[PDB]
């Protein structure tokens, strides 16, 4: 159920340019779907689903991340917004490209990106999963 | 983290003849990076550092003047004429001035140069230094 696993391409960095990735996890789905429900849980700007400027663990440094996708679809999210990309696959990866562009001050950026894709109690049946898993990715500078 | 203390060469123009009692005459640009939990420490090289004293050597080697460094007006630092470090760990990067150790009369000099090493310090009086940065070269002009 759910089965969400995250992975980082390094862990930090101090000089993060635009288009630089930070985390790269993978999401899974069960049956036919059209949206891989994934979220970040940080500080989204209202209905911004596919891109949102996240914040650090301590709240003093902002880090914009282009996770969304290119091709994702804003169809609700759990926890902190999120988006769903074509969920026809059983397991896809989603990398969060950070649009920092400049240098980031030393700190820790923790993200709770995770997803389940599966639909809770709605018109689809499948395996009832009303709970989507969350993830944990830290970006400690070091 | 790391601790990478950056420093750059500088040249001041004030003669010893002025400095009567601990006065700042040379703000050395020191910028620490990543030292959020490390005590940034600067220490003159063995050629200018003798027994725990910092002194400027002449360009042609003639006279020496014992001087101590100070953060001017940046944060609280642990003073010492042989070892300079900050007791409070955290980010820092501000110009450290150069004071004088009980003057020295000042015999007609021309130029003075002093090499200051950078890094961090641990404990106290045990010479717990570590090269973590860059060695700067401070030049003092005298008359």
From Swiss-Prot, chain A:
Domain of life according to the entry: Bacteria
Keyword Signal: yes
Disulphide-bonded residues: none
Residue segments, region Disordered: 66-86
Keywords recorded for this protein, A-Z: Plasmid, Signal
Family to which the UniProt record says this protein belongs: To E.coli AggB.
Protein name: Protein AfaD
Organism listed in the record: Escherichia coli
Shown part of the complete sequence: 26 to 147 of 147
Curated annotation (Swiss-Prot), chain B:
One annotated Gene Ontology cellular component of this protein: pilus
Alphabetical keyword list: Fimbrium, Plasmid, Signal
Function of the protein: Hemagglutinins of uropathogenic E.coli mediate adherence to the upper urinary tract. These adhesins bind to the Dr blood group antigen and also agglutinate human erythrocytes in the presence of D-mannose (mannose-resistant hemagglutination (MRHA)).
Protein name listed in UniProt: Afimbrial adhesin AFA-III
Part of the full-length chain shown: 38 to 160 of 160
Organism the protein comes from: Escherichia coli
Region (Receptor-binding): 1-38
Protein's cellular compartments: Fimbrium
Family: Belongs to the Dr-adhesin family.
